TrEMBL record, chains A, B:
<dbReference type="GO" id="GO:0016491">
    <property type="term" value="F:oxidoreductase activity"/>
</dbReference>
<feature type="binding site">
    <location>
        <position position="155"/>
    </location>
    <ligand>
        <name>FMN</name>
    </ligand>
</feature>
<feature type="binding site">
    <location>
        <position position="14"/>
    </location>
    <ligand>
        <name>FMN</name>
    </ligand>
</feature>
<feature type="binding site">
    <location>
        <position position="119"/>
    </location>
    <ligand>
        <name>FMN</name>
    </ligand>
</feature>
<feature type="binding site">
    <location>
        <position position="118"/>
    </location>
    <ligand>
        <name>FMN</name>
    </ligand>
</feature>
<dbReference type="GO" id="GO:0000166">
    <property type="term" value="F:nucleotide binding"/>
</dbReference>
<feature type="domain" description="Nitroreductase">
    <location>
        <begin position="8"/>
        <end position="63"/>
    </location>
</feature>
<feature type="binding site">
    <location>
        <position position="66"/>
    </location>
    <ligand>
        <name>FMN</name>
    </ligand>
</feature>
<dbReference type="Pfam" id="PF00881">
    <property type="entry name" value="Nitroreductase"/>
</dbReference>
<keyword id="KW-0288">FMN</keyword>
<dbReference type="InterPro" id="IPR029479">
    <property type="entry name" value="Nitroreductase"/>
</dbReference>
<keyword id="KW-0285">Flavoprotein</keyword>
<keyword id="KW-0560">Oxidoreductase</keyword>
<keyword id="KW-0547">Nucleotide-binding</keyword>
<feature type="binding site">
    <location>
        <position position="160"/>
    </location>
    <ligand>
        <name>FMN</name>
    </ligand>
</feature>
<feature type="binding site">
    <location>
        <position position="10"/>
    </location>
    <ligand>
        <name>FMN</name>
    </ligand>
</feature>
<feature type="binding site">
    <location>
        <position position="12"/>
    </location>
    <ligand>
        <name>FMN</name>
    </ligand>
</feature>
Amino acid sequence: MNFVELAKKRYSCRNYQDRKVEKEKLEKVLDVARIAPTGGNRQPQRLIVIQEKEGINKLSKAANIYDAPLAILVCGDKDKVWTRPFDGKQLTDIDTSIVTDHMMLQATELGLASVWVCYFNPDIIREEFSLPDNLEPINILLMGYESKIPESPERHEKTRVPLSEIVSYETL
Amino acid sequence: MNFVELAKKRYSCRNYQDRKVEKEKLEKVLDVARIAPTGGNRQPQRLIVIQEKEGINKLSKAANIYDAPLAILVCGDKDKVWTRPFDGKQLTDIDTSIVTDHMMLQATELGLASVWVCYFNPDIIREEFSLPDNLEPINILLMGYESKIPESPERHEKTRVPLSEIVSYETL
Ligand SMILES: Cc1cc2nc3c(=O)[nH]c(=O)nc-3n(C[C@H](O)[C@H](O)[C@H](O)COP(=O)(O)O)c2cc1C
Ligand SMILES: Cc1cc2nc3c(=O)[nH]c(=O)nc-3n(C[C@H](O)[C@H](O)[C@H](O)COP(=O)(O)O)c2cc1C
């Protein structure tokens, strides 16, 4: 069980069982959101764990969440995030994505199916979860148990472009 | 050797040996940049592997790279990236960060020290590597071998805020 095997087995699940995510597994997923690095060690991530009816219903107003039993809304705090002196670019999406990716890989190791969701209505999320102006919703990570057929760990030959199309050496 | 142990051991190295990164390890790091998911499966990541003198010198014009022996410049292609219908937000930073995080964790497993770098002059990077207007430089991942004392896998009690400060349940 090494990293590449973990990364390959992970796939996007859009078919979830009713079966709830155990608290013990959730807590291990959350631990790695703290462990992850952020620019300047600023730690701008702000997470809302959503597994109860109201919250799940609120999310379903903003996005297709495939009846997943657990969601984590990952926001970034622009009052904490590092801002690059050259151009003013803030690391909000970068820091929060490292955190989300850590959680997604940890979920996978624990046998949880998952899908990363960015196709959500941000203004609905902001209203429903009463986000103040300094928090921006970035990613929603859904997790649960696959109810149908998982995608194959060997699928990437068909589902990704060749490495040579994304990598060059020294120059473009 | 599980995921949390990997995530904890990973730290930011800013003290590198002259010792080059073996090709075999580099290729395993690159493999996971392809394996990683991207929004819409659009695969907008575009990587430049930099381990030769010119390229390293070019990077050193734009950023402090701590004499690392290997760098990967991770760009995103705005002509491929998914664009959210609600607000026009592009996933450029998100997709490229998932890719970079995958590579950083894979590097760690292979015994390579690393540091993620966003404090670079983007216009210098664009000029030096002749990036066309559709590619935006997002992250520089440095890797090599630690020359001094590694940070401790148990440091997070001191180097991170408590989990309770970044996580809430159902509501803020
Ligand atoms: C940043 C990001 C945003 C995504 N947003 C959604 C989403 O809103 N809804 C969805 O069904 N899938 C979403 N996906 C899942 C992708 O469609 C999926 O990762 C990609 O097609 C590759 O498939 P795989 O993850 O099964 O390998 C997202 C993935 C990423 C990385
Ligand atoms: C998105 C991002 C950008 C970063 N940019 C730089 C950088 O430009 N230079 C640098 O020395 N460290 C940079 N870092 C490293 C952080 O300072 C470091 O991850 C943080 O202080 C936590 O320390 P640790 O990684 O040792 O746990 C960056 C880290 C992240 C996640």
